[PDB]
Design a protein around this ligand. Structure first.
Ligand SMILES: Nc1ncnc2c1ncn2[C@@H]1O[C@H](COP(=O)(O)O)[C@@H](O)[C@H]1O
Ligand SMILES: [Mn+2]
Ligand SMILES: [Mn+2]
Length: 200
Protein backbone atom coordinates (compact mmCIF):
# COMPACT_ATOMS: atom_id res chain seq x y z
CA UNK A 1 0.00 0.00 0.00
CA UNK A 2 1.26 3.46 -0.94
CA UNK A 3 1.79 5.88 1.99
CA UNK A 4 0.75 3.45 4.72
CA UNK A 5 -0.04 4.54 8.27
CA UNK A 6 3.14 5.25 10.20
CA UNK A 7 4.15 4.77 13.82
CA UNK A 8 4.93 8.47 14.44
CA UNK A 9 2.84 11.62 14.10
CA UNK A 10 5.92 13.52 12.88
CA UNK A 11 9.46 12.84 11.71
CA UNK A 12 12.20 15.32 12.65
CA UNK A 13 14.90 15.38 9.95
CA UNK A 14 18.29 16.61 11.19
CA UNK A 15 21.76 16.96 9.68
CA UNK A 16 24.48 18.91 11.49
CA UNK A 17 27.35 20.66 9.86
CA UNK A 18 30.42 21.06 12.05
CA UNK A 19 33.83 22.70 12.06
CA UNK A 20 36.39 20.58 10.23
CA UNK A 21 39.82 20.66 8.61
CA UNK A 22 42.31 18.47 6.77
CA UNK A 23 43.38 16.48 8.80
CA UNK A 24 40.32 16.63 11.02
CA UNK A 25 39.99 19.42 13.56
CA UNK A 26 39.69 18.53 17.25
CA UNK A 27 37.29 18.89 18.80
CA UNK A 28 34.60 19.39 16.16
CA UNK A 29 31.82 21.87 16.95
CA UNK A 30 28.32 22.12 15.48
CA UNK A 31 27.95 25.18 13.24
CA UNK A 32 24.60 24.45 11.55
CA UNK A 33 21.55 23.08 13.34
CA UNK A 34 18.59 22.32 11.03
CA UNK A 35 15.39 20.40 11.82
CA UNK A 36 12.61 19.68 9.32
CA UNK A 37 9.27 18.63 10.85
CA UNK A 38 7.62 16.13 8.48
CA UNK A 39 3.99 15.07 8.52
CA UNK A 40 4.13 11.51 9.79
CA UNK A 41 1.88 10.16 7.05
CA UNK A 42 2.64 12.18 3.91
CA UNK A 43 6.28 13.16 4.71
CA UNK A 44 5.53 16.76 3.68
CA UNK A 45 7.61 19.48 5.33
CA UNK A 46 5.39 21.44 7.72
CA UNK A 47 7.93 23.40 9.78
CA UNK A 48 11.64 24.23 9.75
CA UNK A 49 14.05 25.07 12.54
CA UNK A 50 17.33 26.46 11.23
CA UNK A 51 20.13 28.21 13.10
CA UNK A 52 23.82 28.67 12.53
CA UNK A 53 25.93 28.23 15.66
CA UNK A 54 28.99 30.13 16.84
CA UNK A 55 31.88 27.74 17.60
CA UNK A 56 34.00 28.57 20.65
CA UNK A 57 37.00 26.23 20.90
CA UNK A 58 38.08 26.91 17.28
CA UNK A 59 36.14 30.10 16.52
CA UNK A 60 37.55 30.77 13.01
CA UNK A 61 36.24 28.48 10.27
CA UNK A 62 39.03 26.84 8.27
CA UNK A 63 39.20 27.30 4.49
CA UNK A 64 38.39 23.59 4.14
CA UNK A 65 35.32 23.91 6.34
CA UNK A 66 34.00 26.83 4.27
CA UNK A 67 34.76 25.06 0.96
CA UNK A 68 33.05 21.87 2.15
CA UNK A 69 29.91 23.31 3.76
CA UNK A 70 29.61 26.68 2.05
CA UNK A 71 29.32 28.30 5.49
CA UNK A 72 31.32 31.53 5.67
CA UNK A 73 32.60 33.24 8.80
CA UNK A 74 29.92 35.96 8.84
CA UNK A 75 27.24 33.27 9.07
CA UNK A 76 28.52 32.05 12.47
CA UNK A 77 29.81 35.35 13.89
CA UNK A 78 27.34 36.89 16.31
CA UNK A 79 25.33 33.67 16.50
CA UNK A 80 24.38 31.99 19.78
CA UNK A 81 26.56 29.16 20.99
CA UNK A 82 25.31 25.58 21.09
CA UNK A 83 23.99 25.90 24.64
CA UNK A 84 21.63 28.70 23.58
CA UNK A 85 20.71 27.00 20.30
CA UNK A 86 19.65 23.89 22.22
CA UNK A 87 17.38 26.08 24.34
CA UNK A 88 15.94 27.57 21.13
CA UNK A 89 15.34 24.01 19.89
CA UNK A 90 13.46 23.18 23.10
CA UNK A 91 11.28 26.25 22.69
CA UNK A 92 10.65 25.35 19.04
CA UNK A 93 9.72 21.78 20.03
CA UNK A 94 7.30 23.23 22.57
CA UNK A 95 5.64 25.56 20.06
CA UNK A 96 5.28 22.81 17.45
CA UNK A 97 3.49 20.67 20.03
CA UNK A 98 6.21 17.97 20.05
CA UNK A 99 6.68 18.02 23.83
CA UNK A 100 3.28 16.32 24.33
CA UNK A 101 3.67 12.68 25.47
CA UNK A 102 0.70 11.72 23.27
CA UNK A 103 2.36 13.20 20.15
CA UNK A 104 4.91 10.69 18.83
CA UNK A 105 7.97 11.88 16.91
CA UNK A 106 11.51 10.71 16.23
CA UNK A 107 14.61 12.19 14.64
CA UNK A 108 15.84 10.93 11.26
CA UNK A 109 19.49 11.36 10.27
CA UNK A 110 21.75 10.07 7.48
CA UNK A 111 23.86 7.68 9.52
CA UNK A 112 24.32 7.55 13.26
CA UNK A 113 27.04 10.22 13.59
CA UNK A 114 24.82 13.23 14.39
CA UNK A 115 23.11 11.96 17.54
CA UNK A 116 25.42 9.08 18.47
CA UNK A 117 28.73 10.95 18.16
CA UNK A 118 28.50 14.67 17.40
CA UNK A 119 25.80 16.04 19.72
CA UNK A 120 26.47 13.94 22.87
CA UNK A 121 30.22 14.42 22.40
CA UNK A 122 30.00 18.22 22.31
CA UNK A 123 27.42 18.34 25.12
CA UNK A 124 29.75 16.22 27.26
CA UNK A 125 32.65 18.55 26.44
CA UNK A 126 30.43 21.46 27.56
CA UNK A 127 28.85 19.75 30.56
CA UNK A 128 25.38 20.05 29.01
CA UNK A 129 22.68 17.39 29.39
CA UNK A 130 21.30 15.91 26.19
CA UNK A 131 17.54 16.37 25.88
CA UNK A 132 15.73 13.06 25.92
CA UNK A 133 14.17 13.43 22.47
CA UNK A 134 17.68 13.44 20.95
CA UNK A 135 18.33 9.92 22.29
CA UNK A 136 16.26 7.93 19.77
CA UNK A 137 16.49 8.25 16.01
CA UNK A 138 16.22 6.51 12.66
CA UNK A 139 19.39 5.96 10.62
CA UNK A 140 18.13 6.52 7.06
CA UNK A 141 20.89 4.33 5.61
CA UNK A 142 19.59 1.45 7.74
CA UNK A 143 15.93 2.12 6.98
CA UNK A 144 16.81 2.28 3.28
CA UNK A 145 18.66 -1.04 3.50
CA UNK A 146 15.48 -2.69 4.85
CA UNK A 147 13.24 -0.93 2.31
CA UNK A 148 15.42 -1.59 -0.74
CA UNK A 149 17.29 -4.70 0.41
CA UNK A 150 20.70 -3.13 -0.23
CA UNK A 151 23.32 -1.06 1.59
CA UNK A 152 23.97 2.35 -0.03
CA UNK A 153 27.66 3.12 -0.46
CA UNK A 154 27.73 6.93 -0.03
CA UNK A 155 24.69 8.07 1.91
CA UNK A 156 22.31 10.55 0.29
CA UNK A 157 23.98 10.59 -3.13
CA UNK A 158 23.64 6.84 -3.59
CA UNK A 159 20.16 6.63 -2.06
CA UNK A 160 19.03 9.34 -4.51
CA UNK A 161 20.72 7.32 -7.28
CA UNK A 162 18.93 4.09 -6.34
CA UNK A 163 15.55 5.87 -6.21
CA UNK A 164 16.14 7.91 -9.41
CA UNK A 165 15.79 11.18 -7.50
CA UNK A 166 17.46 14.46 -8.45
CA UNK A 167 19.59 16.04 -5.74
CA UNK A 168 17.92 18.95 -3.94
CA UNK A 169 20.04 22.03 -3.40
CA UNK A 170 23.74 22.05 -2.47
CA UNK A 171 25.59 18.97 -1.16
CA UNK A 172 27.02 19.37 2.36
CA UNK A 173 24.62 22.12 3.34
CA UNK A 174 22.85 21.01 6.51
CA UNK A 175 19.45 22.32 5.46
CA UNK A 176 19.79 20.91 1.94
CA UNK A 177 20.96 17.55 3.26
CA UNK A 178 17.74 17.58 5.33
CA UNK A 179 15.59 18.28 2.26
CA UNK A 180 17.13 15.28 0.49
CA UNK A 181 16.53 13.05 3.51
CA UNK A 182 12.90 14.14 3.55
CA UNK A 183 12.57 13.52 -0.19
CA UNK A 184 14.06 10.02 0.15
CA UNK A 185 11.65 9.32 3.02
CA UNK A 186 8.70 10.44 0.91
CA UNK A 187 9.67 7.96 -1.82
CA UNK A 188 10.24 5.11 0.64
CA UNK A 189 6.78 5.77 2.08
CA UNK A 190 5.33 5.91 -1.44
CA UNK A 191 6.82 2.44 -2.01
CA UNK A 192 5.02 1.26 1.15
CA UNK A 193 7.75 1.37 3.80
CA UNK A 194 6.86 1.80 7.47
CA UNK A 195 9.66 3.50 9.39
CA UNK A 196 11.03 2.15 12.66
CA UNK A 197 13.49 3.42 15.24
CA UNK A 198 16.98 2.03 14.63
CA UNK A 199 19.06 3.54 17.44
CA UNK A 200 19.93 1.18 20.28
N1 LIG B 1 35.13 14.79 3.37
C1 LIG B 1 35.15 15.29 4.64
N2 LIG B 1 36.30 15.63 5.23
C2 LIG B 1 36.35 16.13 6.47
N3 LIG B 1 35.25 16.33 7.22
C3 LIG B 1 34.03 16.03 6.75
C4 LIG B 1 33.90 15.48 5.40
N4 LIG B 1 32.58 15.29 5.17
C5 LIG B 1 31.92 15.67 6.29
N5 LIG B 1 32.79 16.11 7.23
C6 LIG B 1 32.43 16.65 8.56
O1 LIG B 1 31.21 16.05 8.95
C7 LIG B 1 30.16 17.05 9.01
C8 LIG B 1 28.85 16.43 8.56
O2 LIG B 1 28.88 16.06 7.19
P1 LIG B 1 27.72 15.19 6.52
O3 LIG B 1 27.63 13.94 7.38
O4 LIG B 1 28.26 14.99 5.12
O5 LIG B 1 26.47 16.02 6.54
C9 LIG B 1 30.70 18.20 8.17
O6 LIG B 1 30.08 19.45 8.48
C10 LIG B 1 32.19 18.16 8.48
O7 LIG B 1 32.46 18.73 9.75
MN1 LIG C 1 25.38 14.41 7.75
MN1 LIG D 1 25.48 17.49 5.80
Amino acid sequence: MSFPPQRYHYFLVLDFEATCDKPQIHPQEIIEFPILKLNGRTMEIESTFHMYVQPVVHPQLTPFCTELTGIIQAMVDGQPSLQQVLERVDEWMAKEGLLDPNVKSIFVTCGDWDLKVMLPGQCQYLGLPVADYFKQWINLKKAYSFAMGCWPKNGLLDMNKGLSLQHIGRPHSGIDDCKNIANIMKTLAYRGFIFKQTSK
